[PDB]
Amino acid sequence: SISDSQIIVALVSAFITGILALRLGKSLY
Amino acid sequence: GPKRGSIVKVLRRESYWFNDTGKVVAVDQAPGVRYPVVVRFDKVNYAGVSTNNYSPDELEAA
Amino acid sequence: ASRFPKFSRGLSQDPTTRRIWFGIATAHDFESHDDMTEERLYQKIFASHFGQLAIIFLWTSGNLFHVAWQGNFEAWGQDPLHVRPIAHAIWDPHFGQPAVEAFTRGGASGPVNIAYSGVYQWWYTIGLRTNQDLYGGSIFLLFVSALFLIAGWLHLQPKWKPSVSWFKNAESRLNHHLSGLFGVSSLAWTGHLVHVAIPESRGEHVRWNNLLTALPHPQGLGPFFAGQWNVYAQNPDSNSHLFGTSEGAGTAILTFLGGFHPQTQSLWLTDMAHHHLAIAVIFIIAGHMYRTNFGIGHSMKEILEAHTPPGGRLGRGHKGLYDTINNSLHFQLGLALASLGVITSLVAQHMYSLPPYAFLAQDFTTQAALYTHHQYIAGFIMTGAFAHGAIFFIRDYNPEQNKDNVLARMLEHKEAIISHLSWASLFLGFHTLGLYVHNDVMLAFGTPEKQILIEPVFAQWIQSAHGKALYGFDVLLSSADSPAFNAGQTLWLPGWLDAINNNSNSLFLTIGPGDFLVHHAIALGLHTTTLILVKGALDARGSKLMPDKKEFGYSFPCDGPGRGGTCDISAWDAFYLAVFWMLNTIGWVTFYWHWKHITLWQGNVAQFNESSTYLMGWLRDYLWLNSSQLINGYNPFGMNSLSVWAWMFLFGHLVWATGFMFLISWRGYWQELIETLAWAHERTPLANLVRWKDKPVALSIVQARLVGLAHFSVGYIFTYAAFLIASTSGKFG
Amino acid sequence: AHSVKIYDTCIGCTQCVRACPTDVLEMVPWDGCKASQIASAPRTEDCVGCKRCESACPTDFLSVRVYLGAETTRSMGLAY
Amino acid sequence: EANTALTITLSTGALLFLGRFVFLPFQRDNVSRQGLPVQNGVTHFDAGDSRAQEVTSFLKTNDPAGFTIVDVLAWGALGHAVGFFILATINNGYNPQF
Amino acid sequence: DVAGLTPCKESKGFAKREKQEIKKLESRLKLYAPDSAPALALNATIEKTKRRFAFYGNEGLLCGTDGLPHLIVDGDQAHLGEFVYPGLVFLYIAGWIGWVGRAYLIDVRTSKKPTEKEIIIDVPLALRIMSKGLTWPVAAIGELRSGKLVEKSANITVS
Amino acid sequence: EWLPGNPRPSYLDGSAPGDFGFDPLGLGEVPENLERFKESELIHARWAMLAVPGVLIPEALGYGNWVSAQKWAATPGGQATYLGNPVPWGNLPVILAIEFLAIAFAESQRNGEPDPEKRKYPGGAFDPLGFSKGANLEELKLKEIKNGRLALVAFLGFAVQAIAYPGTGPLENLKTHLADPWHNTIAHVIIP
Amino acid sequence: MTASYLPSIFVPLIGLVFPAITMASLFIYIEQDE
Numbered sequence A: 001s002i003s004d005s006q007i008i009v010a011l012v013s014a015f016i017t018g019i020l021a022l023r024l025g026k027s028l029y
Numbered sequence B: 001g002p003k004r005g006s007i008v009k010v011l012r013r014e015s016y017w018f019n020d021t022g023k024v025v026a027v028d029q030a031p032g033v034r035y036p037v038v039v040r041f042d043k044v045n046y047a048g049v050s051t052n053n054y055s056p057d058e059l060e061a062a
Numbered sequence C: 001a002s003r004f005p006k007f008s009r010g011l012s013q014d015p016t017t018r019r020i021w022f023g024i025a026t027a028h029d030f031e032s033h034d035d036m037t038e039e040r041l042y043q044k045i046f047a048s049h050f051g052q053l054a055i056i057f058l059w060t061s062g063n064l065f066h067v068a069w070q071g072n073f074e075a076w077g078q079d080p081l082h083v084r085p086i087a088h089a090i091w092d093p094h095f096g097q098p099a100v101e102a103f104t105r106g107g108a109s110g111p112v113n114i115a116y117s118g119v120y121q122w123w124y125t126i127g128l129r130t131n132q133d134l135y136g137g138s139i140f141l142l143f144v145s146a147l148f149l150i151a152g153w154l155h156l157q158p159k160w161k162p163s164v165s166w167f168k169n170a171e172s173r174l175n176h177h178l179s180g181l182f183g184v185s186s187l188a189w190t191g192h193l194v195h196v197a198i199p200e201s202r203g204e205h206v207r208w209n210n211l212l213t214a215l216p217h218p219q220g221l222g223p224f225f226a227g228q229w230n231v232y233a234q235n236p237d238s239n240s241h242l243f244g245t246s247e248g249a250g251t252a253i254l255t256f257l258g259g260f261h262p263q264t265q266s267l268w269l270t271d272m273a274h275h276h277l278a279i280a281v282i283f284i285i286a287g288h289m290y291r292t293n294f295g296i297g298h299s300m301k302e303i304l305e306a307h308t309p310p311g312g313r314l315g316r317g318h319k320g321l322y323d324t325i326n327n328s329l330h331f332q333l334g335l336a337l338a339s340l341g342v343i344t345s346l347v348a349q350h351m352y353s354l355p356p357y358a359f360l361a362q363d364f365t366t367q368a369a370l371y372t373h374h375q376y377i378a379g380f381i382m383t384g385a386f387a388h389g390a391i392f393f394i395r396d397y398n399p400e401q402n403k404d405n406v407l408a409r410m411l412e413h414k415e416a417i418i419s420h421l422s423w424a425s426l427f428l429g430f431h432t433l434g435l436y437v438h439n440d441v442m443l444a445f446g447t448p449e450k451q452i453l454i455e456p457v458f459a460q461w462i463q464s465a466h467g468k469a470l471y472g473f474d475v476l477l478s479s480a481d482s483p484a485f486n487a488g489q490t491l492w493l494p495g496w497l498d499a500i501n502n503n504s505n506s507l508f509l510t511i512g513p514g515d516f517l518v519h520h521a522i523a524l525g526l527h528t529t530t531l532i533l534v535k536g537a538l539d540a541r542g543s544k545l546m547p548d549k550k551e552f553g554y555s556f557p558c559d560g561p562g563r564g565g566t567c568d569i570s571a572w573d574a575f576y577l578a579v580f581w582m583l584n585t586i587g588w589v590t591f592y593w594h595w596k597h598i599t600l601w602q603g604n605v606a607q608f609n610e611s612s613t614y615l616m617g618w619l620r621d622y623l624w625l626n627s628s629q630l631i632n633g634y635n636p637f638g639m640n641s642l643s644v645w646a647w648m649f650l651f652g653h654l655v656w657a658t659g660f661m662f663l664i665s666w667r668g669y670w671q672e673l674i675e676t677l678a679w680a681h682e683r684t685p686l687a688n689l690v691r692w693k694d695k696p697v698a699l700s701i702v703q704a705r706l707v708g709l710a711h712f713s714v715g716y717i718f719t720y721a722a723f724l725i726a727s728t729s730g731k732f733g
Numbered sequence D: 001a002h003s004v005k006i007y008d009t010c011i012g013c014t015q016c017v018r019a020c021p022t023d024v025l026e027m028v029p030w031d032g033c034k035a036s037q038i039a040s041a042p043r044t045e046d047c048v049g050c051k052r053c054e055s056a057c058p059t060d061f062l063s064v065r066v067y068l069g070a071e072t073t074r075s076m077g078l079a080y
Numbered sequence E: 001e002a003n004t005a006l007t008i009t010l011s012t013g014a015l016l017f018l019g020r021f022v023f024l025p026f027q028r029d030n031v032s033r034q035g036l037p038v039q040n041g042v043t044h045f046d047a048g049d050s051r052a053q054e055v056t057s058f059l060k061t062n063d064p065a066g067f068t069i070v071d072v073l074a075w076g077a078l079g080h081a082v083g084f085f086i087l088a089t090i091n092n093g094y095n096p097q098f
Numbered sequence F: 001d002v003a004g005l006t007p008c009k010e011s012k013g014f015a016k017r018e019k020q021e022i023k024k025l026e027s028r029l030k031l032y033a034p035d036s037a038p039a040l041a042l043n044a045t046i047e048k049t050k051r052r053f054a055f056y057g058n059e060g061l062l063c064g065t066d067g068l069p070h071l072i073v074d075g076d077q078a079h080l081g082e083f084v085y086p087g088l089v090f091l092y093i094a095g096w097i098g099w100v101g102r103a104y105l106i107d108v109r110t111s112k113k114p115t116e117k118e119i120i121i122d123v124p125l126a127l128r129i130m131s132k133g134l135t136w137p138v139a140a141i142g143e144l145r146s147g148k149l150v151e152k153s154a155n156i157t158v159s
Numbered sequence G: 001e002w003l004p005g006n007p008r009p010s011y012l013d014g015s016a017p018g019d020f021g022f023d024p025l026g027l028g029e030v031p032e033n034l035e036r037f038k039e040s041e042l043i044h045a046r047w048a049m050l051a052v053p054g055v056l057i058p059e060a061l062g063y064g065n066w067v068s069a070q071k072w073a074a075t076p077g078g079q080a081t082y083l084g085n086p087v088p089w090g091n092l093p094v095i096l097a098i099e100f101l102a103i104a105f106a107e108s109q110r111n112g113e114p115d116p117e118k119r120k121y122p123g124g125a126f127d128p129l130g131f132s133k134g135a136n137l138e139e140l141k142l143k144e145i146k147n148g149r150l151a152l153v154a155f156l157g158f159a160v161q162a163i164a165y166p167g168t169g170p171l172e173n174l175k176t177h178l179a180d181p182w183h184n185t186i187a188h189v190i191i192p
Numbered sequence H: 001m002t003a004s005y006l007p008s009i010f011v012p013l014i015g016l017v018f019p020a021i022t023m024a025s026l027f028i029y030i031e032q033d034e
């Protein structure tokens, strides 16, 4: 990630994955 | 049940004296007793008692 | 279901603070919940598995991203001997200027940590040469973790839930696992090694943009489909090959060379490709064995039923052993954990002798960390296997279905097994301690020539049978006339005999009287640990002291003071006692390994070879001597890079000691203390406006044992990780 | 909330009820051993788990068995 | 030179002969002996599985001996395996004896 | 020879392990008069050291690369004096102890108060059994052959 | 009667041919196990009876060694025969192919028989001389068994001698015996 | 490090704020009778 936009891409992808994990946890409870 | 002073071997699966021998003391001959045979053993259990009562179908080896 | 634990009523109606604790403890025991059926349980297992995979892949992607963003991978690639791999950067607002100047080593612009996990050599071997590749891997792993989370949520929706009868389809599941998950995965790895790893090792760049252009062999796929398979083993790399460049590199993709690459001192890439191809074919062939729905294939129940030998030597054989393993999840969990814990020790024992990554065995501080890590993991796993075997015996075993099979006859004669394990452990301990103390006294009285030094003739004979030529045994692989020698003379022995007869690597290090005693101490540790665990698992259903233990469950504190005293009687307590012995055995093994390799790397093997036969030598030449830079990590004269470890080390001790607090003192004191603390809080002004909701109570009995064991284990792990990293990396062998 | 049980082997020693410091166990007419006595646990809602009952029955294994269950304020022995 | 088109066809033909002719009653009796995977006393399909159903639309055959397509697949796979195991060996030349 | 160890009477590292110790003892000795108890004790120690080092070389033990004996517990006929020869006499003594203890227990068990005869030994009977316990193998094997060694109605129970 | 006077087990009553009462390990205690064991013994005996001339003849006539007579592999060429003429169709793969196929067919044929009597004593096209029609038959079975066990022992001796004395056959060992019976004997490999 | 201003933004937002809010949320969820 020697570039600058790539960090933002990683951040937004981590956020999407977090929302997915949130939905899964809600379904598990 | 068995005779007095008879040496019988226990079969009660949850007994400290399982597969051990003991001499009967006095079997009560009442009509509705569920465990009339009284047998005393020569080795105490974890609690320290050596006498216990069983049903006639629960111990016999002679 | 109206309070914190909604899966249990007993904890909901608990007014005390214990409701909190036992809510976090019994949070994953889906079996002992409220209103549980065999179809909700399995689907919860499925979804939790998906979540676990997601977490694993997120962790791996994080490692990739943090090595790509803050690491110095590119610099390390062009000088993997005079640079230190950076794990990540640190930003601690409590730091002082000397700490910033101390931790700013390497090539970084600020303070950073040094990666002792060996990921640099791994990633460099498989063909990663730029931070761009690491970032691509990281985003791809984020993607696959998102996909796993998607599937985990999907398979909980009512339309797509699998049935309980689908899970119990053992035949098709084993078939598909064996074929796909093993063979096809190994085949794909072979493809990657052939296409991307081996050419990048030869020197030429190969990526997605030119996959279909650059072929991995000058005559690709012709000889393969014509059966002329030796063409792919024509000319390998020579002793002059520089890993990374094309200075003396061949063109063969598959071969069987044996030994280590003379530069990197690691196995040949083509050898790994060939091995993966072979095991892929083996697994794919072994897949098609059980009948799924195509007519052919076995019935894994009639196989079990058919193996009762005639003569009644072991009763009714394996009749009924299918339903027990199918219906009971703890049986499968125990089998899985045991089989996994054997191979996660196999990897530890192998990766150090035969380093599989480029420029490993030169990071003297990484191999130690890897070995210690994997051995402690293996110890914990081997303990968990027996724990779950005991749980199965308690709550899943049916004595009527398992009528007179082998599993019942194991309970039928358990007294003999426990007696003989007792005898073996007693014998080993008596004699090992006796010899060690005798040598200690002999060295103490100034007469070192009167100690019982025993040469390990059996292991030395085995090493000689593997090709070592130090003990002159000349048996079966040192003999030049043995057919075993002539058979492999053309294929791999030129490299194997070369590597094993070089006394500078970890391939079958020489052994003397000092190794004998440590191997016997290891045997004693293993024996005592299995004794505790087997005694627990067997007398988990009931003993003469308490012949109804199955009705009380796995973990219960005791059965009162009566009947002489029945404290610490459950099977969970057997496991809790065995954890200590597991930690002790693994500590012995790691001490042995670390001292042997420290003395090998320094240059004086004759210090271990001579100062280990007694016991003060271990305390003075290993523990006390190798702690000189650790504790000096900071002093009234300054501080240096090891300071953090010098902290962590001490930290460990503290935690370790705190464990004793929960294991020596018991509840009845702390409850009688809390009962007056509550009084003091209630009878004070200005502080009785506040008020607790959960009544404060002392920790429970099994809870106290658990917290004590957790503290003991965390301290034990930390104060040794710190020491093994500081004493090695502070000297680098 | 603990679960007390009295199996049909009590010889009517009356020691279980004498030992229990909560007035939980009581005697009951039940013909069959010697004296038509047996134990009975009607007030299990007050047992703390003292296990003084089990430490008194001089039977082979036992005739009165306490099983520790859901915890409450009475069973925890709290006074605050 | 090790010619292929004849050696692997000879291997496949030999193992197809073995399957169709000499081992077919043995194979049939051993399959019928241990018929269907069974859980708790009843097969997977009847225990409930839309995916544990045999495919008779794939098994309906006409060979007088009942040589379905999966038997041909299996015996030909073994034939190709032995054929390539023979092919790969006779191309090197060695001397691994006593 | 075996295991790459040289015999001890040719080991050039045993000579040092001897002469260094000797010289240390002499350095200790030179702090007294040759007619005083410390000097006599030290000379006795030196003579004992010489007698010890002039026995290992003659026995046939193999020394190491550091000048220290190493025991070949293998079964090698040229080295039976290290493990199997003392092991046999130890096994004899231990079987003796175990057999006489077992026989004492067996005899005491058939008495009036067998528990009393275990905190208060009866020396005549114990001595008789200790005496008769010389030929224990010929008795243990005889009890095994005659089916008198083991029981069958053991009192283990597990519900 | 392998031990004059000793009794017999409850299953070794001597009815079977070649039965003497030898079972110290107690293997034939189970009936079906004994029924399989008898047929297995007969098969081993017949194979060893076939093998013994097959090793004794070609060493004196075709000049082989029965362990070098199989050495011609791993080296292209060999395939000697009776007069020594090379068999042109004796290439190892294409010879192992038929060696497998023919024996597989023969065994898969023999395996299909329910009758144990016809199992170990087929007859028919295997007795094409009327040797077992109605004449002395139990005596013929006894002769067959007594020769088969001797052949088994002889072949075991073959295989142990060829290992103790490598690179030689069991016929030069007879000449070694009769060169010095009192120095050349088993007391060399047993007591080195 | 490209950004080099993110470690000053995140560890204060992950070692101080994240526990501060999740402990409060979990304490509200624990100490409630529904």
Ligand SMILES: CCCCCCCCCCCCCCCCCC(=O)OC[C@H](CO[C@@H]1O[C@H](CO[C@H]2O[C@H](CO)[C@H](O)[C@H](O)[C@H]2O)[C@H](O)[C@H](O)[C@H]1O)OC(=O)CCCCCCCCCCCCCCCCC
Pocket (backbone or CB within 6 Å): C008, C009, C010, C011, C021, C022, C024, C025, C026, C032, C033, C553, C554, C555, C556, C702, C703, C704, C706, C707, C709, C710, C713, C714, C717, D069, D070, D071
């Ligand atoms: C990886 C960690 C990730 C980070 C985690 C950090 C989070 C902080 C940890 C929180 C720990 C909370 C305090 C400890 C747990 C409380 C102890 C306790 O209540 O303990 C008791 C628990 C709960 O007991 C249960 O108690 C039950 C009580 O029943 C209750 O529940 C029943 C239904 O559940 C009914 O409702 C019933 O009415 C009701 O009373 C029954 O007795 C069950 O049989 C019994 O299991 O017991 C059990 O089985 C124990 C369950 C845990 C077993 C795991 C032990 C493993 C220990 C390995 C050693 C650790 C080493 C660390 C190494 C690290 C190296 C660096």
Ligand code: CLA
Pocket (backbone or CB within 6 Å): A010, A011, A014, A018, C055, C058, C059, C061, C062, C063, C065, C066, C088, C089, C090, C091, H006, H007, H008, H010, H011, H014
């Ligand atoms: C599990 C993987 C993992 C771990 C342990 C770490 C650890 C760390 N990261 Mg990090 N990171 C990761 C993945 C990971 N990272 C990924 C995938 C990305 C790309 C989005 C980043 C992007 C990132 C940045 C930009 C920064 C860090 C920083 C840091 C450090 C300070 C903590 C912090 O601010 O985190 C903040 C974390 C995030 C902003 C994103 C979290 C990433 C994933 C989604 C979390 C994984 C969830 C996890 C598996 C569940 C844990 C469960 C557990 C509680 C039981 C710390 C060493 C800081 C640093 O370098 O300080 C020196 C910093 O500035 N990280």
Ligand code: CLA
Pocket (backbone or CB within 6 Å): C045, C046, C049, C050, C053, C166, C167, C169, C170, C172, C173, C176, C177, C179, C180, C181, C182, C185
């Ligand atoms: C080809 C078909 C196929 C494939 C690929 C899989 C694959 C998988 N199934 Mg699956 N399944 C299938 C068919 C298949 N299934 C069928 C037909 C059924 C119907 C019965 C099921 C029913 C089923 C259930 C019920 C469950 C799974 C689960 C799983 C997962 C196991 C966990 C895991 O990833 O371990 C990965 C393991 C490996 C990659 C094997 C590695 C080999 C050893 C162990 C390690 C060696 C590593 C090597 C030496 C070094 C590499 C390390 C490197 C860093 C150097 C895995 C993804 C489980 C799961 O995850 O749930 C979601 C689960 O609970 N399956």
Ligand SMILES: CC1=C(/C=C/C(C)=C/C=C/C(C)=C/C=C/C=C(C)/C=C/C=C(C)/C=C/C2=C(C)CCCC2(C)C)C(C)(C)CCC1
Pocket (backbone or CB within 6 Å): C330, C331, C334, C335, C338, C339, C342, C385, C386, C388, C389, C390, C392, C393, C537
């Ligand atoms: C309690 C219980 C349980 C558990 C158990 C366990 C946990 C176990 C473990 C165990 C173990 C963990 C074991 C292991 C084993 C191992 C082995 C057995 C090995 C072997 C090896 C081998 C065989 C080798 C060989 C060889 C050699 C030596 C050399 C060369 C090569 C070869 C390979 C040949 C269960 C759940 C089941 C059930 C219930 C109960």
Ligand SMILES: CC1=C(/C=C/C(C)=C/C=C/C(C)=C/C=C/C=C(C)/C=C/C=C(C)/C=C/C2=C(C)CCCC2(C)C)C(C)(C)CCC1
Pocket (backbone or CB within 6 Å): C281, E012, E016, E072, E073, E074, E075, E076, E077, E078, E080, E081, E084
């Ligand atoms: C109709 C008819 C007929 C005909 C038939 C035919 C013509 C047949 C053919 C058949 C065939 C023609 C078959 C084939 C098959 C094949 C197969 C089935 C294949 C498989 C393969 C495999 C599986 C392979 C694998 C592999 C790979 C891929 C790689 C490498 C390794 C291996 C080799 C393993 C007749 C005349 C008789 C009669 C009348 C009717």
Ligand SMILES: CC1=C(C/C=C(\C)CCC[C@H](C)CCC[C@H](C)CCCC(C)C)C(=O)c2ccccc2C1=O
Pocket (backbone or CB within 6 Å): C661, C662, C663, C665, C666, C667, C668, C670, C671, C697, C698, C699, C700, C701, C704
């Ligand atoms: C100290 C002590 C107590 C009393 C200790 C108490 C009440 C524990 C509470 C300590 C504080 C309040 C919590 C500490 C916080 C931790 C750092 C982490 C908490 C758990 C995480 C999940 C947050 C016992 O009750 C006890 C019982 C039986 C044997 C030994 C002992 C024992 O040693």
